Amino acid sequence: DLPLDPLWEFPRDRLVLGKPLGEGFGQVVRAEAFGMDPARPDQASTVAVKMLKDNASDKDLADLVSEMEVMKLIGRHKNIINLLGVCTQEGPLYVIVECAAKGNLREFLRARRPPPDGPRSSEGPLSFPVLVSCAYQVARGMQYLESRKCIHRDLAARNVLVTEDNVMKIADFGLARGVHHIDYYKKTSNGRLPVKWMAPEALFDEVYTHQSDVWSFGILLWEIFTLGGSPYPGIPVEELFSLLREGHRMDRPPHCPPELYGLMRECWHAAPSQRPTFKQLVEALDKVLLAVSE
Ligand SMILES: *C(=O)c1nc2c(C(=O)Nc3cc(O[C@H](C)c4c(Cl)cncc4Cl)c(C#N)cn3)cn(CCN3CCOCC3)c2cc1Br
């Protein structure tokens, strides 16, 4: 029996749930909405519905409620997943957000790795200026979130969604992260080791700043230009600990210009103050994007 928010309340009967998309902090199901635009009541639209699992411990609810409230106040930005509406009255809690039809950035890239009929046999779906654009968009989305004082605490390609128009949208930015209980050896459902995105001050000192998201952004950069690779590939977690303590970093990935590996290394500077800010990252990536001629 949650309170009614008229601005965000959407009739649940105007939703038609489809196939589930993924899990977590609750689950997410693809659905069709009717009249999401109040000007066109009978117009369908494909949205993503966030709801509780069948676990329903009351802190799962509180966490989803908490995420909902964050979604309400973050505001609108093209490079983050935006709230469309919520269903709270007379039924299960739904959090309706934008749907990115091409999945997350990692799945997007791995499915588009280069391959002999035709004039462009060698040409894969992914070009350098499009990879830079992906990075630049995530940077500006993160720049926005930082300005609204929203730390991500888990920034990865897995948490960056790709729309039909190849627009990068940052997801799951307003979340309870379980910061004080992280199983550093625990890999997720899709085999991800979140510890490999953690800044040293976050990993060793449990300290999160916007600069700790910058470290993660550098890891996200490595993912992009490996076309969906897993960072510290094949390296056991036990090694990652002593590896970072000795100040070691990932090598420069194949077919990656020194401009971008330089940016990566900058984001991975030990001291938070000697890392670029997202604003500086946006500008630097823009200059690269500018250098693409025509
Ligand atoms: C609807 O536009 C639509 N969405 C998807 C997605 C998809 O991932 N949508 C999506 C997922 C979201 O969060 C989940 C939990 C999620 C997943 Cl499933 C994966 N990685 C990260 C996260 Cl956060 C959110 C949110 N918030 C919003 N939208 C995936 N697909 C399938 C892509 N399709 C597969 C077959 O080849 C072509 C591409 C879709 C499809 C659609 Br229509």
> Please, what are the domains in the chain?
12-98 (3.30.200.20), 103-291 (1.10.510.10)
Using a 6 Å cutoff on CB, does residue 99 contact ligand 1?
A: yes
Round to whole Å and give the CA distance between 99 and 85.
Answer: 13
In the residue annotation, 154 being an active-site residue is answered as yes
What is the residue whose two structure tokens read 């609108």?
A: 76
Using a 6 Å cutoff on CB, does residue 199 contact ligand 1?
A: no
Report which of 65, 74, 73 is spatially closest to residue 95, judged by C-alpha positions: 65
Which regions of the chain does DSSP assign to beta strands (E)?
Answer: 15-22, 27-34, 44-51, 83-87, 94-98, 160-162, 168-170
Using a 6 Å cutoff on CB, does residue 100 contact ligand 1?
A: yes
What separation in Å is there between the alpha carbon of 101 and the centre of ligand 1?
6
Round to whole Å and give the CA distance between 95 and 51.
Answer: 6
Round to whole Å and give the CA distance between 22 and 29.
Answer: 7
Q: DSSP character for 118?
A: S
What is the residue whose two structure tokens read 């199901």?
A: 29
Q: DSSP character for 36?
A: S
What separation in Å is there between the alpha carbon of 131 and the centre of ligand 1?
20
What was the elucidation method?
Answer: X-ray
Round to whole Å and give the CA distance between 104 and 115.
Answer: 21
Round to whole Å and give the CA distance between 211 and 273.
Answer: 8
Ligand-binding site membership of 28 (annotated): yes
What separation in Å is there between the alpha carbon of 9 and the centre of ligand 1?
23
Inter-residue contact 223 to 246 (CB < 8 Å) = no
Ligand-binding site membership of 266 (annotated): no
Kindly name the residue from 1, 13, 37, 154 that is annotated as catalytic.
154
For this entry, resolution in Å reads 2.3
Chain-centroid distance, C-alpha 203: 19
Tokens of 80: 């983050």
Ligand-binding site membership of 118 (annotated): no
Tokens of 251: 């090598």
Inter-residue contact 94 to 50 (CB < 8 Å) = yes
Using a 6 Å cutoff on CB, does residue 160 contact ligand 1?
A: no
Inter-residue contact 94 to 87 (CB < 8 Å) = yes
